[PDB]
Structure 1
Amino acid sequence: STGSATTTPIDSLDDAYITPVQIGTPAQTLNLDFDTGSSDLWVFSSETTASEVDGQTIYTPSKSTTAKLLSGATWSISYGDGSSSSGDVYTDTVSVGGLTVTGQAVESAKKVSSSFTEDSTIDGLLGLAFSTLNTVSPTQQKTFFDNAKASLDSPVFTADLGYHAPGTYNFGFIDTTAYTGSITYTAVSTKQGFWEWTSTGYAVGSGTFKSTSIDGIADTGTTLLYLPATVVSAYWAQVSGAKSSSSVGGYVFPCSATLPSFTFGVGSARIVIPGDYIDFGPISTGSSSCFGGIQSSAGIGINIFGDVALKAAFVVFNGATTPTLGFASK
């Protein structure tokens, strides 16, 4: 089997991407944030504290003839940005782009933190990291990909995120029309539960490539590119007027600037992030100070190849017995 679904930016900055997911019988379609940095599939639901729902589409398990309470199971998760959610668990039929999993753990939110409430466009998350990070207790549950894997033509999914445009998540096949050149594959460590890999270096604009190992995770659920402070300083030093602002919470730059590209290494191959991808617009409405799309990972404890980086590539998440990551230009 295979699946193929379009993923769509939630706003004009590509702050996140939503992908329609069918849950239950008859189908209830919710727009979920596919997140290769976590491993819970959770949804706004009929169980969510009413005051914490503001415009989201909810899953109502009582209206699904295939929903079954997973008795005793609870979940609770906290994300890198400080947001959180928790609740109980049902199993139900879940389909993504024509690919169907029966008995998928659907984690029903009883509580969500403010940032989820305030984002009316995201109805939940669908985790695509390794199932070892799944938070369901006392019986840990498998991700959608993990459940689908054996049925797939090939044990892979691909992320093809758009810049200010829709893109695609494919399951079970590699669309050879979706990228240029060849795919360069690179080793993955699953020891932390993430799609963790080592970039071979970077360049700033038309500058020379710096060979240096940068360990990080491929995380579709993180908006920006978080890298060591040395790397980030080297980038923003090429932008006149750019500075790190503690009050704003990172690097800002004059909105009148033309940003240089940023290149990152995948083995001997190179992925180029155009400068425009690194612009996240005025820090507040009408401001002439703009927020940068490359930020320091110092104090995160890990480097994060988020959407800024991933949307510049066609990315293969290879879930074979020995997982790997593939990157191609597009």
Structure 2
Amino acid sequence: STGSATTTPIDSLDDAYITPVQIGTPAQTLNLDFDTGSSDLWVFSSETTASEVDGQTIYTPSKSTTAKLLSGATWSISYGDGSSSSGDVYTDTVSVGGLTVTGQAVESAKKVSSSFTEDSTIDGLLGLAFSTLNTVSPTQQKTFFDNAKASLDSPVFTADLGYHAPGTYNFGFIDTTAYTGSITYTAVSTKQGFWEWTSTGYAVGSGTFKSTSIDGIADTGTTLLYLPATVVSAYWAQVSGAKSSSSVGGYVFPCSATLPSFTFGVGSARIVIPGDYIDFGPISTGSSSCFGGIQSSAGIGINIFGDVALKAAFVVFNGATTPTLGFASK
């Protein structure tokens, strides 16, 4: 089997991407944030505290003839931005772009933090990291990809995120028309539960490539590119007036600037992020200070190849017995 679904930016900045997902019988379609940095499929639901729902579409398990309570199971998750959610668990039929999994754990939120309530466009998350990170207790649950894998034509999914435009998530096949050149594959460590890999270096604009190993994760659920402070300082030093602002929480730059590109290495190959992809717009409405798309990872504990980096590539998440990642230009 295969599946193919369009993913759409939630706003004009590409702050996140939503993909429609069918849950239950008859189908209830929710728009989920596909997140290769976590491993829980959770949704706003008829069980979510009413004051914490503001415009989201909810899953109502009592209206699904295939829903079954997973008795005794609870979940609770905290993310890198400080947001969180928790609740109980149903199994139900879940379909993505024509690919159907029966018995998928659907984690129904009883509580969500304010940042989720405030994002009316995101009805939940669909985790695509390794199932060892799934938070369901006392019986850990499998991700949608892990459940689908055996049925897929090939044990892979691909992320093709657009810049200010829709893109595609494919399951079970590699669309050879969706990228240019060849795909360069690179090793993955699953030890922390992430799609963790080592970039071979970077360049700023037209500058020379610096060969240096940068361990990080491929995370479709993180907006920005978070890299070591040395790398990030070298980038912003090429932008007149750019500075790190403790009050804003990162590097800002004059909105009048033209940003240089940023290149990252994948083995001997190179992915080029155009400068425009690094502009996240005014820090507050009407400001002439703009927020940068490349930020320091120093306070995180891990480097994160988020959407800023991934949207510049066609990315293969290869879930073979030994997982690997593939990157192609597009």
Normalised by the size of structure 2, how large is the TM-score?
1.00
Shift of 1:173: 0.1
Deviation per CA, 1:240-271: give whole Å up to 9, x if none.
Answer: 00000000000000000000000000000000
Aligned partners of 1:65 and 1:47: how far apart in 2? 17
Shift of 1:88: 0.1
Shift of 1:12: 0.1
- Name the SS for the 1:244 alignment partner: strand
Aligned partners of 2:321 and 2:80: how far apart in 1? 28
Deviation per CA, 1:57-103: give whole Å up to 9, x if none.
Answer: 00000000000000000000000000000000000000000000000
Deviation per CA, 1:195-238: give whole Å up to 9, x if none.
Answer: 00000000000000000000000000000000000000000000
Shift of 1:167: 0.1
Deviation per CA, 1:288-309: give whole Å up to 9, x if none.
Answer: 0000000000010000000000
Aligned partners of 1:214 and 1:264: how far apart in 2? 9
In the alignment, structure 1 residue 268 sits paired with structure 2 residue 262: no
Shift of 1:158: 0.1
Aligned partners of 1:35 and 1:246: how far apart in 2? 28
Aligned partners of 1:172 and 1:193: how far apart in 2? 21
Deviation per CA, 1:112-146: give whole Å up to 9, x if none.
Answer: 00000000000000000000000000000000000
- Name the SS for the 1:312 alignment partner: coil
**Structure 1 unaligned spans of 5+:** none
**Structure 2 unaligned spans of 5+:** none
Aligned twin of 2:33:
33
Aligned partners of 2:323 and 2:41: how far apart in 1? 21
- Name the SS for the 1:145 alignment partner: helix
- Name the SS for the 1:241 alignment partner: coil
Aligned partners of 2:54 and 2:90: how far apart in 1? 23
Aligned partners of 2:83 and 2:20: how far apart in 1? 22
Cα-Cα RMSD = 0.1
Aligned partners of 2:282 and 2:81: how far apart in 1? 20
Shift of 1:35: 0.1
Deviation per CA, 1:30-57: give whole Å up to 9, x if none.
Answer: 0000000000000000000000000000
- Name the SS for the 1:257 alignment partner: coil
Aligned partners of 1:298 and 1:198: how far apart in 2? 17
- Name the SS for the 1:106 alignment partner: strand
In the alignment, structure 1 residue 192 sits paired with structure 2 residue 189: no
Runs of 4+ residues over 2 Å off in structure 1: none
Deviation per CA, 1:151-190: give whole Å up to 9, x if none.
Answer: 0000000000000000000000000000000000000000
Aligned partners of 1:116 and 1:23: how far apart in 2? 20
Matches within 5 A, 1:67-82: 67-82=67-82
Aligned partners of 1:83 and 1:159: how far apart in 2? 24
Aligned twin of 1:149:
149
Aligned partners of 1:280 and 1:299: how far apart in 2? 20
Aligned partners of 1:9 and 1:49: how far apart in 2? 27
